[PDB]
Design a protein around this nucleic acid. Structure first.
Length: 327
DNA sequence: CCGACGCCGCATCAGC
DNA sequence: GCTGATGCG
DNA sequence: GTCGG
């Protein structure tokens, strides 16, 4: 549905969500507001009353009341007030820096650090992640056109194969479902040598190679199974530089790889639906495994999975192309 | 009425 | 120094 | 804040 349909309502609910998460530190209210905003965003009619909205799942009494105030007055008194609150708006804003969460944002504002300029002037109060988040503040908020995701994927797949042609690497996320833009790049990596009952440095060797060709530019976090950092496509000698981008690389044991690919391909709604159906057929699927459930509900041992389609076959579902996993 | 609302790797803190 | 908790994503 | 056991 077009924004003009209920965009005022859904914008209000998203703003309220952000203040619950970042200022009130009420994560379940953040998700409640997000859920309400999403069910309304998909409603194909211009809402006329709170009562009409309350019929949708995730909209309750209090959001219905807020919708009534918004429809009658064009605003919400509580939102107008917190918007102009210097401390609350600064706390909310600072959490847009990757690495600054609600706790750090509150501590910064408490000691008078409220803006990007304030952070800039106080480097020694920032940890490594937060320094990177500040350095790439604008770039990290830009989306990534699919054409650049393809160029990025070209680099990742080539360098991974260069390190060891037995690696398997899959770029997941909405990109794998065919999205025309992405927010970041999520790479799932495995190697036949690595199983859940099992080489050294398997993730390190790939990260190192991507740094050696100057694709990975910074590291936010790095361990034996998960890397989170920053990358940048090369620019033509004369053209403007590409924005720096967020890339994650996860090393997963081969026997759990396709459960991971499935989960991290999504969508979120599709995953929920597939897990729901799985339980109906007596299986429990999580990010790692699919296990049979006995007649008393006791989970059995993980079942062998050698492809995404194996998982579909277990639950008697015909294979769904990533492109068709919107729900 | 009242608990659930995902989970866990990594960086860093709190406490010992 | 180690162990567990917390913040963050 | 909403849902539901």
């Amino acid at each position: 549905p077009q924004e003009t349909l209920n965009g005022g309502i859904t914008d209000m609910l998203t703003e309220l969500a952000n203040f619950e998460k970042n200022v009130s530190q009420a994560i379940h209210k953040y998700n409640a507001y997000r859920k309400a905003a999403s069910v309304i965003a998909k409603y194909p009619h211009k809402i006329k009353s709170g009562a009409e909205a309350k019929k949708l799942p995730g909209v309750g009494t209090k959001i219905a009341e807020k919708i009534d105030e918004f429809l009658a007055t064009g605003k919400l008194r509580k939102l107008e007030k917190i918007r102009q609150d210097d401390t609350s708006s600064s706390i909310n804003f600072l959490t847009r820096v990757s690495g600054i969460g609600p706790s750090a944002a509150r501590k910064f504002v408490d000691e008078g650090i409220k803006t990007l300029e304030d952070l800039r002037k106080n480097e020694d109060k920032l940890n490594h992640h937060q320094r990177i988040g500040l350095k790439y503040f604008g770039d990290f908020e830009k989306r990534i056109p699919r054409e650049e995701m393809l160029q990025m994927q070209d680099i990742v797949l080539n360098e991974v194969k260069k390190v060891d042609s037995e690696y398997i690497a899959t770029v997941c996320g909405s990109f794998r479902r065919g999205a025309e833009s992405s927010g970041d790049m999520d790479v799932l990596l495995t190697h036949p040598s690595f199983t859940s009952e099992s080489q050294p440095k398997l993730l390190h060797q790939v990260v190192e190679q991507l740094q050696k060709v100057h694709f990975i530019t910074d590291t936010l976090s790095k361990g034996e199974t998960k890397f989170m950092g920053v990358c940048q496509l090369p620019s033509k000698n004369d053209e403007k530089e590409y924005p720096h981008r967020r890339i994650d690389i996860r090393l997963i044991p081969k026997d759990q790889y396709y459960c991971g690919v499935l989960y991290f391909t999504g969508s979120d709604i599709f995953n929920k639906n597939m897990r729901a159906h799985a339980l109906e057929k007596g299986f429990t699927i999580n990010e790692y495994t699919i296990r049979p459930l006995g007649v008393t509900g006791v989970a059995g041992e993980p079942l062998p999975v050698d492809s995404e389609k194996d998982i579909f076959d277990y639950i008697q579902w015909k294979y769904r192309e990533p492109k068709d996993r919107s729900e």
